[PDB]
Amino acid sequence: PITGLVYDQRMMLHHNMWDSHHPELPQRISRIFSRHEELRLLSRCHRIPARLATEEELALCHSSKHISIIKSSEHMKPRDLNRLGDEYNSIFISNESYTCALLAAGSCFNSAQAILTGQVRNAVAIVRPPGHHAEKDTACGFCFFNTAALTARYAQSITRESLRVLIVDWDVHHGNGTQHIFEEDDSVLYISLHRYEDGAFFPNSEDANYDKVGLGKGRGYNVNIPWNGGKMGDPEYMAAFHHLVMPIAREFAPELVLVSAGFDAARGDPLGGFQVTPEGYAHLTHQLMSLAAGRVLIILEGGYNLTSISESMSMCTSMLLGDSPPSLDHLTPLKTSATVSINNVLRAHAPFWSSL
Numbered sequence: 023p024i025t026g027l028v029y030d031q032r033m034m035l036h037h038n039m040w041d042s043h044h045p046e047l048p049q050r051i052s053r054i055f056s057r058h059e060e061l062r063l064l065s066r067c068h069r070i071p072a073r074l075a076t077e078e079e080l081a082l083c084h085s086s087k088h089i090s091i092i093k094s095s096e097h098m099k100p101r102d103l104n105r106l107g108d109e110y111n112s113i114f115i116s117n118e119s120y121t122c123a124l125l126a127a128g129s130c131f132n133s134a135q136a137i138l139t140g141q142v143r144n145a146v147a148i149v150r151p152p153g154h155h156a157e158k159d160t161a162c163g164f165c166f167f168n169t170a171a172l173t174a175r176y177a178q179s180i181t182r183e184s185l186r187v188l189i190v191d192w193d194v195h196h197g198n199g200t201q202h203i204f205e206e207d208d209s210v211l212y213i214s215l216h217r218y219e220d221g222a223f224f225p226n227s228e229d230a231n232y233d234k235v236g237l238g239k240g241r242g243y244n245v246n247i248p249w250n251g252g253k254m255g256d257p258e259y260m261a262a263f264h265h266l267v268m269p270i271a272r273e274f275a276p277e278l279v280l281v282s283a284g285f286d287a288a289r290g291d292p293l294g295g296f297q298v299t300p301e302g303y304a305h306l307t308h309q310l311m312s313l314a315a316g317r318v319l320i321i322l323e324g325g326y327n328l329t330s331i332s333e334s335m336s337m338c339t340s341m342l343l344g345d346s347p348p349s350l351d352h353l354t355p356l357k358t359s360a361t362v363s364i365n366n367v368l369r370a371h372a373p374f375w376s377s378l
């Protein structure tokens with residue numbers, strides 16, 4: 023019963039040279055690492071090394087053009103870097119960005135390999151830049167390559183092509199990239215909870231609504247749980263897991279669970295406006311550990327309050343290590359709109375999931 027942990031300080035070299043206080047800070051990953059140290063969680067984990075993804079690995083989800091453009095930024099002067107970054111929605115680029123993104127992806131491949139070969143039971147990946155907004159052909163929302171989507175394909179590449187991978191994306195934003203990449207795929211079940219506001223929240227697309235259930239062979243294998251009109255917190259997320267995430271996941275019977283674990287739904291986050299607590303995140307993790315024979319990989323996505331994300335992700339790792347869930351606060355009655363969101367998803371997915 024071993025928990026893997028990957029962290030490599032080289033991943034802080036990706037930085038914003040015009041706005042050094044941009045919220046996607048290098049010290050996001052070092053602060054999470056430090057909090058694992060001072061909670062004495064780090065020494066309880068088995069350290070998994072980082073590595074670069076290869077270009078061939080990137081091609082599992084991304085076009086050759088996009089790979090070549092981000093790759094070319096390593097040798098760019100600042101004027102090129104600022105101009106290229108401005109070609110995307112919410113991207114900054116430095117000469118180190120490409121390498122950091124390769125390290126983020128490769129760190130997760132190694133963690134997935136360790137899980138799948140039984141060297142560890144589960145694992146946590148403290149990586150940046152994040153991934154779930156990255157599309158097949160473009161960068162977006164602080165993400166260059168879709169680390170979680172790539173890890174699901176990497177996992178299938180070292181097992182069998184049809185390995186059932188569940189991606190739970192509890193970052194406060196919709197994983198537009200992850201949805202698109204697997205939208206026609208029934209071997210990767212994508213479940214995202216996100217602040218939506220009828221499309222008035224980044225990434226600002228109706229693709230995130232509950233009626234997008236997947237396409238072609240993938241119909242039923244895309245589950246959007248969109249939040250509207252309400253500062254959601256632990257009661258709402260517990261309810262979504264009880265009514266939607268856990269029943270669908272158990273029916274799917276994944277062989278590997280990837281968490282796109284953004285922590286910007288956390289209490290205190292400057293962008294998300296939500297109030298999921300560190301103990302809420304522990305319970306969400308503890309619940310996901312009842313799937314896939316405990317084979318869970320927690321991948322850092324967003325989350326921008328350094329104290330909030332450090333405590334929040336440390337508590338997830340505590341659950342991975344087998345610690346008992348901390349007690350939740352008395353769960354207030356669900357915001358009315360949250361009940362409406364859950365009922366809309368239930369109606370959308372009852373046709374495909376008999377457990378609903």
Ligand SMILES: O=C(NNC(=O)C(F)F)c1cnc(NCc2ccccc2)nc1
Nearest residue numbers: 112152153163164193195224284323324
């Ligand atoms: O937090 C986000 N996405 N969630 C993730 O996990 C990500 F890290 F992969 C996010 C992405 N883009 C934006 N654009 C707007 C804006 C840019 C700069 C500052 C403040 C706002 N916003 C929020």
Ligand SMILES: [K+]
Nearest residue numbers: 191193195215
């Ligand atoms: K999400």
Ligand SMILES: [K+]
Nearest residue numbers: 204207210243
């Ligand atoms: K899918």
Ligand SMILES: [Zn+2]
Nearest residue numbers: 193194195324
């Ligand atoms: Zn986010």
